[PDB]
């Protein structure tokens, strides 16, 4: 319900098999580059090395995985806070900037409101957890051709994406005989 | 998250199938990755499909539907108040999509698919077995996997696969009566 | 329910079969009740939808409006 703003988040596992230390990063809207997760996790309040791994790894006998993250942890006890995770992202002008993006376009469904930070951490855990299940071959590539993760857009929805697009025009040509009325 | 997601689905399912939650909505519990997905989205495709729950007293896993219903529904053939939809609601029938299909077991004919295990006219084709005891919804009729154009071919099973696809582009280039008016 | 305003004239009731003949549009009117009753366009109608008068139409009623059943 509410636009077409499109908003693509990726979690790439930099690093091939063996290639040194398999770091994780990710990506975001209006942004310069990537980001190790650890930060961002710091940035949603999630801070303690490990109060994160919970967000991601869900059970604690999974060393394997764990370990797999061990070198991410490392890319950031160059940052041990919430305001300097916000940091990493260009002072007071640019921290705002990031407590935005991580409400306004970093995982928009969920919500865009204020407080709905752990709501996402968690997700971003999720992501990451399937992102490693899949690189540790305990799980399979994601299939791009399951009818199931596709839709059809019928007439509705389409009448519908113009209707908003012009109803948007009458709407504001009128914010104009109006600017020029004064009377 | 949810512990005892079992006692939940059930409930879910009785609720879409009673009619209190929409019948669109899909409702998938993966057991073994411990997700439970509920999807109301729009544009998803979906269907047949009739239902099975063991829901029998005097023996084994059955279809819910029955000569009873079917026969009142016919009922409603010569009267030309039993509609498809009431099948929907009295739960004989459910709508499935894709995703949800993943977690079932469908049966094909339902017949010769679940009457117990007990000669062969050599010209009948060769069916496989019954191997499966789990079924949860059985296919309405196989022919519907087809669409408007092929549904018109006399016999396409005895028939090589792309040919059938060609007649199906031609069928639409046939001449005749397009409309009474 | 669809209408149509011929220049220099009343608003006709609109009939699929009619528009098909004169190149007109089976579309209907768009009214919004804007605060401090008002139309802003029309809206092409899906025949045999909720507005299309053919949605409630009897057989005999069709032929009547010349419309294949």
């Amino acid at each position: 319900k509410g636009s077409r703003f499109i908003s693509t988040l990726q979690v790439k596992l930099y690093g091939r098999e063996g290639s040194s230390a398999r770091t994780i990063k990710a990506t975001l809207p209006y942004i310069k580059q990537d980001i190790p997760i650890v930060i961002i996790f710091r940035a949603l309040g999630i801070i303690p090395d490990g109060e994160i791994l919970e967000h991601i790894c869900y059970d604690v006998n999974d060393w394997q995985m764990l370990e797999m993250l061990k070198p991410c942890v490392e890319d950031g006890f160059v940052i041990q806070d919430r305001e300097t995770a916000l940091d990493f992202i260009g002072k007071e002008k640019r921290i705002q900037y990031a407590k935005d993006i991580l409400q306004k376009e970093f995982l928009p469904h969920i919500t865009q409101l204020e407080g709905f930070e752990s709501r996402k951490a968690f997700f971003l855990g999720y992501m990451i957890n399937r992102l490693l299940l899949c690189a540790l071959d305990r799980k399979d590539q994601d299939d791009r051709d399951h009818f199931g993760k596709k839709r059809l857009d019928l007439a509705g929805p389409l009448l519908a994406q113009l209707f908003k697009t012009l109803f948007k025009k009458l709407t504001k040509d009128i914010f104009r005989y109006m600017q020029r009325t004064v009377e | 998250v949810h512990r005892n997601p079992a006692r939940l689905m059930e409930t879910l399912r009785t609720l879409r199938r009673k009619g209190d939650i929409n019948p669109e909505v899909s409702m998938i519990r993966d057991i073994r990755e411990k997700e439970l997905k509920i999807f109301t989205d729009a544009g998803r495709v979906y269907r047949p499909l009739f239902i099975v729950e063991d829901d029998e007293s005097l023996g084994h896993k059955e279809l819910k539907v029955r000569k009873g219903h079917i026969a009142k529904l016919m009922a409603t053939e010569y009267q030309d108040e039993y509609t498809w939809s009431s099948l929907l609601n009295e739960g004989l029938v459910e709508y499935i999509d894709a995703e949800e299909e993943e977690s079932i077991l469908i049966a094909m004919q339902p017949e010769d698919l679940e009457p117990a295990e007990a000669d062969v006219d050599p010209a009948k084709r060769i069916r496989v077995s019954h191997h499966a005891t789990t079924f949860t919804h059985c296919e309405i009729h196989p022919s519907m996997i087809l669409g408007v154009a092929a549904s018109i071919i006399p016999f396409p099973d005895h028939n090589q696969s792309p040919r059938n696809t060609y007649q199906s582009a031609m069928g639409k280039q046939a001449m005749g009566v397009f409309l009474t008016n | 329910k669809p209408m149509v305003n011929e220049s220099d004239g009343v608003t006709h009731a609109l009939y699929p079969q009619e528009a098909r003949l004169r190149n007109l549009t089976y579309s209907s009117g768009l009214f919004v009740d804007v605060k401090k009753k008002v139309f802003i366009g029309r809206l092409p109608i899906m025949l045999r939808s909720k507005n299309c008068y053919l949605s409630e139409a009897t057989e005999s009623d069709l032929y009547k409006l010349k419309e294949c059943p």
């Binding site: - | 079917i70 498809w84 939809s85 | -």
Partner: peptide, 30 residues
């Protein structure tokens, strides 16, 4: 006899049923 199960044949009624109630283009109207 009411309770009793179905056979193949019988499913064509059920189809029948659907189709009368939705027709061939539901998808577009709906």
């Amino acid at each position: 006899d009411e309770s009793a199960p179905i056979t193949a044949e019988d499913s064509w009624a059920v189809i029948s049923a659907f189709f009368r109630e939705k027709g061939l283009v539901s998808q577009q109207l709906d």
